[PDB]
């Protein structure tokens, strides 16, 4: 009498687990573009004088 509710609840879980496993495998396999970068600055602390350009 319960054989089908077991089987039906399982079919739903197996499909949901499949679909989530597919997106999770890519989420976990590669993760660099999903991260961040230093984005550093210039400051010009070595600028002890004027440049060679006529504009400086």
């Amino acid at each position: 009498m319960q054989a089908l509710l077991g089987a039906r609840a399982k079919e739903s879980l197996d499909l949901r687990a499949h679909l989530k496993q597919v997106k999770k495998e890519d989420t976990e396999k590669e993760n660099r573009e999903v991260g961040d970068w230093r984005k550093n600055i210039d400051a010009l602390s070595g600028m002890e004088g004027r440049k060679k350009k006529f504009e400086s």
Partner: protein
């Protein structure tokens, strides 16, 4: 230079263009779909200055540029500018020439044929990509969401697609493609802000309004109660900082603009709105397929970030829907980026490696091949 020749993945919308490589969970970079051109006479010499700017360059130097968008309502009308965008997107920024990698592009399933054909043609003839596959955007939204069944309503900048998919199959007779989108919400906001005393008409002004919308606007799940107060009191207004230090406040207009997705008449459009099109995508399917589509309204694309859109899209459908039935909105964090993410997922499937147009089949058949091999 790469570990494997996986596909490059890029979602080209009417708003943003996003790209990265297949197998990751994010694009490396996002660009506006823009090619910019100077609208002024140069006077100083040796200032660098390009004849045309692409993507973020176009937006960054926009102070003296007129900015054009090559994509409108989901299709490419200016392929030359998309060629510039793809070069920048794939080679200048991801640092990968398409010549050595398959490329996965995207388009809606009822997207005019010329666009899926042109995307196939340019990547094969100007970039020499070894393979092509133009993805169904709804499919990618489902891949990113972890669903096989549901209505994909992608409310992007270009077009709202409204497609019912059941067990991985489309129900095409029930697709309600609608020419109501995020780009119209931006122009409506420029006009309503003009009514408030803050006129916006130029490219710079449009980019400001798009920034205002993205930070200040919302849908409101119950707009009648929300406007009764927002239109009556300053306590519901939110301030926005403009590039020159000016401050604009927006009240009921803050949600009235997004409200157009439910009230299309605000922009002169004849439409039922996105909640009724979701309803009809469900209702026009057979009764043994609607009980699953009602329980799976799949939100995707951009504009989905407005607070109240998911609840506003579930309440309206529930009101149109039969009683007893459970109506459910799925609105994951992979919003706006779900198509790109799904693209990455599709590209990495082992079964998808049999779906590619090779740069052999392409030349034998020509670009019309996209309809024989992709969709």
């Amino acid at each position: 230079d790469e570990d494997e020749t996986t596909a490059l993945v890029c979602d080209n919308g009417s708003g943003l263009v996003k790209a990265g490589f297949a197998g990751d969970d994010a694009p490396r970079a996002v660009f506006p779909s823009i090619v910019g051109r100077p609208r002024h006479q140069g006077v100083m010499v040796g200032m660098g200055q390009k004849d045309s700017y692409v993507g973020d360059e176009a937006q960054s130097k926009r102070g003296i540029l007129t900015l054009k968008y090559p994509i409108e309502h989901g299709i490419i009308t200016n392929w030359d500018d998309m060629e510039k965008i793809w070069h920048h997107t794939f080679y200048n920024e991801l640092r990968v020439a398409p010549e050595e990698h398959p490329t996965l592009l995207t388009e809606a399933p009822l997207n005019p044929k010329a666009n899926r054909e042109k995307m196939t043609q340019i990547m094969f003839e100007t970039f020499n990509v070894p393979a092509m596959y133009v993805a169904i955007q709804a499919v990618l939204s489902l891949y990113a969401s972890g669903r096989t069944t549901g209505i994909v309503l992608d409310s992007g900048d270009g077009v709202t697609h409204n497609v019912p998919i059941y067990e991985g199959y489309a129900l095409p007779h029930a697709i309600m493609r609608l020419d109501l989108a995020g780009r119209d919400l931006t122009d409506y906001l420029m006009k309503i802000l003009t009514e408030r005393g803050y006129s916006f008409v130029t490219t710079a002004e449009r980019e400001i309004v798009r920034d205002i919308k993205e930070k200040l606007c919302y849908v409101a799940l119950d707009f009648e109660n929300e406007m009764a107060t927002a239109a009556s009191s300053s306590s519901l207004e939110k301030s926005y900082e403009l590039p020159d230090g000016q401050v604009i406040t927006i009240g009921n207009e803050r949600f009235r603009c997004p409200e157009t997705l439910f009230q299309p008449s605000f922009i002169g459009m004849e439409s039922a709105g996105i909640h009724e099109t979701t309803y009809n995508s469900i209702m026009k399917c057979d009764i043994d397929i609607r009980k699953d589509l009602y329980a799976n309204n799949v939100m995707s694309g951009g504009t989905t970030m407005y607070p109240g859109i998911a609840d506003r899209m579930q309440k309206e459908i529930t009101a149109l829907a039969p009683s007893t039935m459970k109506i459910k909105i799925i609105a994951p964090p992979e919003r706006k980026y779900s198509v790109w993410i799904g693209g990455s997922i599709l590209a990495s499937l082992s079964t998808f490696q049999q779906m590619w147009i090779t740069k052999q089949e392409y030349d034998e058949a020509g670009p019309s091949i996209v309809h024989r091999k992709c969709f």
